[PDB]
Structure formats: structure tokens, C-alpha cells
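Quarterly update, task 2.4: fe (iii) ion-bound model.
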Amino acid sequence: DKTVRWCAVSEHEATKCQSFRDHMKSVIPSDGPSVACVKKASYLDCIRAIAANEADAVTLDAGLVYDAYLAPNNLKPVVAEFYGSKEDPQTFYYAVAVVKKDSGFQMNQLRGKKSCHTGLGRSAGWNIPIGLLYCDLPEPRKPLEKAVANFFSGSCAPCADGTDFPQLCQLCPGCGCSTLNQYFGYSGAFKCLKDGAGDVAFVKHSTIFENLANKADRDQYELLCLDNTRKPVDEYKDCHLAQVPSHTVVARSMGGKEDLIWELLNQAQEHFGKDKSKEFQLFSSPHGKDLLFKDSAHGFLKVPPRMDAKMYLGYEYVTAIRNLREGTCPEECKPVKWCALSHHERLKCDEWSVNSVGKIECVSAETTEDCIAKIMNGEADAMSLDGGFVYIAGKCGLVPVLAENYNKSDNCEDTPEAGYFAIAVVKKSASDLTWDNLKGKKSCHTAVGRTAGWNIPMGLLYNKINHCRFDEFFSEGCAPGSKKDSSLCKLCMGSGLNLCEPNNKEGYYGYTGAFRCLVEKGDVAFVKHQTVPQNTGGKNPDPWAKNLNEKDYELLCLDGTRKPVEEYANCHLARAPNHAVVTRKDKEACVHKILRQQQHLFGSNVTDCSGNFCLFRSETKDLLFRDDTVCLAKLHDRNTYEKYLGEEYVKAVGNLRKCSTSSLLEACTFRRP
Ligand SMILES: [Fe+3]
Ligand SMILES: [Fe+3]
């Protein structure tokens, strides 16, 4: 159709929208995008109209971005307003709790303090902090402003009924909803803090930088962090209540026309964005402020497709809003929801769950990235990950809690390992094959984004050839998780929709699968140093592996040589950080504790994995954990993805950034670049 039906709320917005259509029809050719204008009564009416295909697009505050996500509207964010520059565009703000340096209290000591709020019902100054504190408030919690006044010893809460809740105006008597109140709004809440009236202001991070000249000033303040520590205000990205999108174009989740919407708004900012045209302005109006888009906006960015509303708002924001909206609280550790990679893993997890005495629960997802996304948003808590996805999870905010260890040791739990080895395996009867001409040969990979399967060897290949078209360097291959039309899906063996999927419905997914792919169709397999021994000499009983001999396979060396499989130490491509379990920072304590308990009960201490449950039970498919996992090891100081993986591997993965096809990585780096 190529017509975007924008939704306006007021006669003013509908006027501006019509002007927007007219000026676009004058500069965009007939084959370009256009606008149509639908006037509805409220942001809520616009949300429904988009859901019912009566409209297409509307820009929303974060609070309505949440509501628009809920059943039955199922809208999603598709285009973002930004507010800085094209070289540093500021799509999100950060709700922060700013205090005076050295005032002697943490987040869990806020009760009986004096609080400075921007306004009653506002976002960063109320709904977010009060949302996060909701269960800390004293029952009865409705009405909210009474529970809040019984929480803080006194406040400034502009726009609140003073007569009803008089403790809420101690710092601004009467609680002026106008800016005649000196502590009204963002700058006024911060003056309430700077002035000594309150002990904490709930403001945006940018409120601090625009009310303090230099860093020496900002050093006089600190931020309250959710882990009950303080950090400097400059460290707001690592110390905030929530990340909030400033203004979000939303659309239908299927058939929403996001690409048309983006082309419409991309073309619009070129012609009519900040300082582009004297004839028309997207970001102002002679009919009123903030019509359709914010007058402060400098342009638009496309929201990465993997993003849904929960991911976009962030976990912390959703938690706070859930609490206030639902108006209901919950009453040891929570049992850990493990995310299983499809039904092959879901079965082993279920046996784990029933034998765990209630401490492990299971969720499923069809890809690793989908699982990481459930852990991010709270639908799950933990899983083990190849280092390549440890990297991505960290980019997405998750943290490693325990490592898989593979070396036999009298003290495995407490002995860091240096890593395994990424190797290129070939068939010895193919004597020609050399690391210096795989060009046009056929490749087998554990999965896109995995360390030995992909990051290491494609890292090296991208240095040699300096383009990312790996499916054209190889004639064909199997790299589960590639684009379905890729020649790196051709050698895969899954049936139907399972072909090339990065789960065990694709028999070539994983270390064993990449090796099977080599035996059966390909010329080179990128796997770990242990994989050929694990599947030869009868150790793997399946018909394809039964008769394979270790000696029939060889390792390609970096120097162009070839050694046997047992000689990986002098003939590998790189070290590979062990696989690790990841979770949210708020589940790190419980997951570290629960897993160490579980592996005492079902780890490598176990005699006869036939009689009892065995979390690391050596089957073929590395279900949940790698089949050669000896124990889960403590991480000590190496507890971010950078520290756990090490500078080495991180610059390795980083060098591949331009080639990345990970939709989840693009989504998380959009929320934190
Ligand atoms: Fe606001
Ligand atoms: Fe791996």
C-alpha cells in the first residue's frame, strides 16, 4: 500500500498530521511512503485502533508502550525518537535516585528519609521509584500516596492532594502542580536535593548533568544502586532504577508495517527534521508542543526487529510498572527456572526438576537467543552457554555465575581452567586440504555464534579475506542458525522447518553434529579438541559414529601442518573460554547457591548414572551442559562477561562485530551501545 496511517489524539495533532502528509506528498515521489491521518480521542484509543488495523503508528511514553504491549493489543516498538546527535543519539533516559555524598544510607534504607519527586504520577519521579519500592511500602498500599507518606518521613510530591496526604508536601507546602513551586518538576526536585530539603531526588540521569556545571560538582553527589551500594553519578549506566525509552513509535506485531513506518520517518527527518526546512518541521508546530513527536527530538532510529516491549522497556522498568499496575505483592530462594534448548533438552531438565526436590523448574525455547531473552525478561533464570553466547548475554546485561570445568582434578569446584581448544578437523584421506585454501570447500560448524564452531575460525577467516560473506567463501556448509537461504544451511540434515535450526532437531547442531556433518557431507568441522575422541572408538554408539576411527581424522594447524587429533595442544586455532551459566544480577546469589547444592547431589560424585540422575551425564548431545562437564566451578572476581572471557576472546569476538547476524545482539547493543 505504502501508506502509513498515523494516529493523532487531538485536533491539533490531526492538524499537524495533515500538514505532515501534505509536505511529504510534495517531496516524496509516488513510489515513496505517504501518510494518512486518523484522529482518535486518546492515546488508549489510538492503541486499540492500531490493533484493529484501523491505524498503523503512534508515538508513546514508556508507560503506554507497556500498556500497548499487553493482551489484546500486542503492539511492539518499531521506531525510536532520539535526542542527541547522529554520532551520540540518546534514545533512553535513566531513572536514578540521586543523593548527597556521604549521607549514610542505601536503597534499602530509604524509609523515613525525605524524598523529592518531580510530580505525583510522573514516571522517573514516582511510578518507577514507588514501583520498585511497592512491596517495601506498609499495608494497606492502596491508596498509594498514603502508603508513600507513611514511608518517607516527609516529601515534596507536586500535584498531590495536600489535605489528604499532608506528609507528602513537607518540603513544598501545598504541593504546587505549577512551576511556581520551586521544587516542582525535574530541575525543582533536584533543587530540593541540592537545597538540603530532601535526602533523595527521583529524577533522570540527565537532570544531574544539566543542573551541575562540572564533574567536581557531580562528585558531591552519589546514586543509589539497587544492590544497596552507591556509585558516582557519572556511573548512572551502572547504577539506575530503570532504563526508559523516551518516545517510541509502536505498531502491530504482525503486519505492522514497520519497514514502511521507518521509511516514512527516515525520509521525513531528511526533509523536515531538526534544521532541515523552513517550510515544515516534524519537531515543532504553530498549533502546540509535542504534537505527534517530541519537540526536543533530533531524529529517528529504527528499533531492531528482535526487540519486543519487555526487552525494550527493560526488566527493571517492567517490574516497577507491574507492581503499581497489579497493586499486589508476593509474600528463602526462588526455585531456579532453567531454560532448556527445545524438547530434547526439556526432557532432561524435567527429570532434573522432579529429582531436584522442587528447587529446579524448566522453561523451553527453540533457540539459545530466545532462551537468553527469557532470562533477560524473567520468564527464566539460568542456562549454560558457549562463550560466544556468554559474550552476547553479557552485552544483554546477564552475568556468568559458574563455569563448566572439564579437567579432572581433586578440587574441581575451586580450580579455574584456562579453556578448551578450538580445532579444525579434516579427514586424513583428504590429504590435500590446507588451512590456506578452504576456499570453495564445505564447512561444518556447531552453530552460528559459538566459539569453536564459529567465532574463532570465522574470526580468523575474516582477517584473511576481510569480508563477511562466509557463505560465498565456502561453497556450502552447515552452520545451524544461519539465514535459511544461505549455502551454510545446505549440508544440514534437519527435516522441514528443522533444517538449519540451532537446536537438536537439527542433527548437525553442536560439537557432535558438526563432526557428524564432517563424516557425512563436509570437508572441515570446527569443534573442540575433545570431540573426535568423544565420538570414535565406539564411545558413541549411533550407527553413523560406531565404526569411526580416531586415526581416520586429522587436525589442521595454523602453520599449515597437520597433526593427529590427540595433538591439539600444538595444533589448534585458539583457546576457548569454558562454557558458563548466566543469569540476571538479581538471581546471581540464588543461582550460585542452588547449583552448587545440585551438583553435590547429581554431579560427577555419582556412581551409576543408570540408577540415579546425573546432571552432566555423558550422552551425545551436550544436553543442558556439555557431556564432558566435570563440575561447575566458582568464578571469584571474573564475574562479568569481559572478565570471565578475557581480553583475548573479547577482542576476538569484537573483531567479528561487522559480520554479526545475531538479532539479539543488535537489540541489546541498541539498548546499551
Ligand atoms: Fe516526565
Ligand atoms: Fe563451545
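Highlight for this quarter: The pocket of fe (iii) ion (ligand 1) is lined by residues 122-123 (CB under 6 Å).
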